[PDB]
Amino acid sequence: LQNIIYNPVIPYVGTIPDQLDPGTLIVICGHVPSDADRFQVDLQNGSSVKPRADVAFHFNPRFKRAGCIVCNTLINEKWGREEITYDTPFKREKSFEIVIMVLKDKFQVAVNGKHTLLYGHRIGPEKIDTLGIYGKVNIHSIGFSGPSSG
């Protein structure tokens, strides 16, 4: 991988190395803390806190009850329609590997080598230049792979 970040402190907010052109991969390896309630991975347009930066893609695994993954987009500080995935591969006290592939019309996400969900772009991905990770989660590494990697 390229531009790897190891054991980052959460909350984590860092500029992404390259434009997320179709085919780009975002690999995030971590572990879910005991009794974690939730955590999130946000692909943002900037790092402004106020006004809060738009979130092109909000990937938010929730663990209470049966557990799920909520995906949404924040525009001008307003959340849009939630897209919920009820078949979540995340579990407390277990490690994980998240692979987000940026396609032309959507994001494709796989966890632990298994397809998990799709999310159509609401904001042009070229507007994303910042990665944010918040919540109860331990991140081991963050890596990026461009479309022409090899």
Ligand X SMILES: OC[C@H]1O[C@@H](O[C@H]2[C@H](O)[C@@H](O)[C@H](O)O[C@@H]2CO)[C@H](O)[C@@H](O)[C@H]1O
Binding site for ligand X (CB under 6 A): 58, 60, 70, 72, 79, 82
Separation between Cα atoms, residue 133 and residue 140, nearest integer Å: 12
Q: How far is the CB of 24 from ligand X (least distance, A)?
A: 24
Q: How far is the CB of 46 from ligand X (least distance, A)?
A: 18
Q: How far is the CB of 79 from ligand X (least distance, A)?
A: 4
Task: Copy the structure tokens of residue 39.
Answer: 């955590």
Cα angle at 51 between 46 and 56, to 5 degrees?
Answer: 45
**Smaller CB distance to ligand X: residue 25 or 54?**
54
Q: How far is the CB of 49 from ligand X (least distance, A)?
A: 14
**Smaller CB distance to ligand X: residue 6 or 79?**
79
**Smaller CB distance to ligand X: residue 107 or 144?**
107
**Smaller CB distance to ligand X: residue 23 or 135?**
135
